[PDB]
Subunit: 195 residues, 3 copies
């Protein structure tokens, strides 16, 4: 929805945390995006894999509630409690202290999740960031793909909060936000004085 | 046609043999595709270069028959005689012991074929694989591009069967099929027992 | 317009000069294009960044005339005075001895121009090539992006003719044209004799 797009404008967010932290181009690329979003006052604008995976998300959500019996509340963008212009959009608030994060990737990506039993470190970061913004205690990581035989369609794993990884993330994100605002500050002053 | 798409589902085929054999990512990428095709029960789904080259194929076919006078029979997917789930789709059965393989690539690719007089090793593999599935003795390799001056439009070269390259191919393909089926076997057993 | 497309067919042009000169694949890639254009008798055929940047070009043109008060004449393809099949399409003839060259890139590219105050060396080459075909004395390099705050939207810098860089360019371009024509010559003779 357009509400939340506007809440997201220019903030670092859970799913881009791996880019912020990457040992790279995807960091400065991400920075540039956010600088532009802030300066221009909007975002830019998705393959049929993404589109299809979006449709399937509610199928996953339901399968999870079937599986567990949890009460899951859909939510908006949750701003970090302390770090301003930083936030998260979890797929839902599970019970009183949990979260859900749902993937509907390509069949092959799904299979590799079944194969290894573990979410990619970039998703670990994404979830840890969610827990950090929501002060929640665990996140359930669902992967779902209905094109598969029945016992391969659904996968779930819990990832417990981790205040250590969270501590790092908060630093890096704060540092990166410092850079990003000074970079904006800087251009303004050149452009300004120059005018 | 959809008939042949279904005959192709999940099999290694002549034109992907270079990927199987590559000294690489394109091998495991190909493997993943075939695993998915088998497990999901279908394929995924082409630029205007491909689309255009498909239209031009019958122009090439005719030019070849004009040039040679051969009787060429269009055929479906031809399964390897011994290696199961392996096959080939030659562009036609030329006479009693020949095949045709037709390219309508970009103008520049065509010119480089005129320039060197030889088909790319990946096409050598593709044709050798055709001869292997059809027990045919040679394949005529046509390249065609009508955007060119007249004497550059059409190129043809014969490639004789080669039971040595064919021997290798059959090994690699068999090995790769072994992997691919065990990989499927494996996931089933994890998923199964896990359910 | 289609007039100028036909004037451009098969010639090296100002904006592709960096490719000709590159220390690479983009050189032979460019060569192949031009060979194909000459042999086939036409060009091949752009994202929404390009499309959008094209729309904005007249906004830039006007802003420049607002800023300076110059009389700017839009022009076609200007053929090099001596080197045949070589030419330039400047964005306009400024006054009696100037040129304009207008960019409407992505916001981030624009910002990096504000940041460094200097046009990318590939644009230096492009402008020098314009001066070389027009015998003009300077080129004004405009970058424009209206999505930005007001004092960041518009940037301008002058680049004086430079007969030294121009001398180099003319060599490289002549050399590259020699190659390109002999390459065409060559294929003809193979194809010809072969027929
Ligand atoms: N533009 C757009 N439309 C729809 N879905 C999107 C879009 N961008 C990202 N996403 C998805 C991908 C992430 O899982 C989540 C953003 O979460 P966060 O924690 O806020 O990074 O939403
Ligand atoms: N999806 C699809 N549609 C149309 N044509 C295709 C498609 N995939 C491959 N091809 C072409 C490319 C190969 O020359 C041949 C497959 O031959 P084989 O020996 O079976 O690999 O058909
Ligand atoms: N196909 C097409 N349509 C519209 N605009 C184009 C096209 N190709 C290049 N350009 C733009 C990019 C260059 O600034 C200029 C060509 O200038 P020159 O000095 O001639 O290289 O025009
Ligand atoms: Mg999700
Ligand atoms: Mg073919
Ligand atoms: Mg321009």
């Amino acid at each position: 929805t357009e509400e939340w797009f506007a809440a997201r404008l220019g903030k670092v967010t859970a799913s881009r945390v791996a880019d912020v932290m990457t040992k790279a181009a995807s960091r400065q690329n991400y920075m540039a995006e956010l600088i532009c979003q802030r300066l221009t006052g909007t975002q830019e604008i998705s393959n049929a894999a993404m589109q299809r995976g979006t449709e399937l998300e509610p199928h996953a959500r339901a399968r999870y509630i079937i599986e567990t019996g949890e009460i899951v509340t859909e939510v908006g963008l949750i701003d970090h409690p302390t770090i301003a212009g930083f936030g998260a959009s979890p797929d839902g608030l599970v019970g009183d202290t949990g979260l859900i994060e749902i993937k509907c990737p390509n069949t092959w990506t799904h299979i590799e999740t079944i194969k290894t039993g573990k979410p990619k470190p970039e998703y670990i970061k994404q979830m840890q960031t969610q827990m950090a913004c929501t002060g929640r205690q665990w996140c359930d990581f669902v992967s779902y793909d209905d094109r598969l035989p029945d016992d391969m369609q659904y996968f779930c794993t819990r990832i417990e909060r981790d205040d250590a990884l969270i501590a790092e993330i908060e630093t890096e994100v704060s540092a990166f936000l410092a850079e990003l605002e000074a970079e904006i500050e800087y251009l303004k002053r050149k452009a300004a004085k120059l005018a």
